[PDB]
């Protein structure tokens, strides 16, 4: 059956400031990752060219509590939409080995992401 994987949306944790927790996010096709606003001032947004092919597009509303159903296999990386410059990025893998994970970790993408992307990859 489906699983659900709630994610905090917090101004402040162990990785700094603006952070989702967890920053990796591993999933199956037909599950659910839950965005929680612990911290107002937040959304969750899919970046362009950063998802996998065939998946859609989607964009939360600030402030609110935001369901995502993965279906298609592939690495995702989400931003924060205020706050993307700042770091505020979740990696969701949704099934074994990824595609597109290789890809996602050389786009251009700014500096404090990409070093807590390279982080996020090491925990795993
Ligand atoms: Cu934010």
Do not use: W
């Not at 990796?24 to 998802?51: C, L, Q, R, W």
């Amino acid at each position: 059956a489906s699983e659900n994987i709630e994610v905090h949306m917090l101004n402040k944790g162990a990785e700094g400031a603006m952070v989702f927790e967890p920053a990796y996010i591993k999933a199956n096709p037909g599950d659910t990752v839950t965005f929680i606003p612990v911290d107002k001032g937040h959304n969750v947004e899919s970046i362009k060219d950063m998802i996998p092919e065939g998946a859609e597009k989607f964009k939360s509303k600030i402030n609110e509590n935001y369901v995502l159903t993965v279906t298609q296999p592939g690495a995702y990386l989400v931003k924060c939409t205020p706050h993307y410059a700042m770091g505020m990025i979740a990696l969701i893998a949704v099934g074994d080995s990824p595609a597109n994970l290789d890809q996602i970790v050389s786009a251009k993408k700014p500096k404090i992401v990409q070093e807590r992307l390279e982080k996020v990859i090491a925990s795993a």
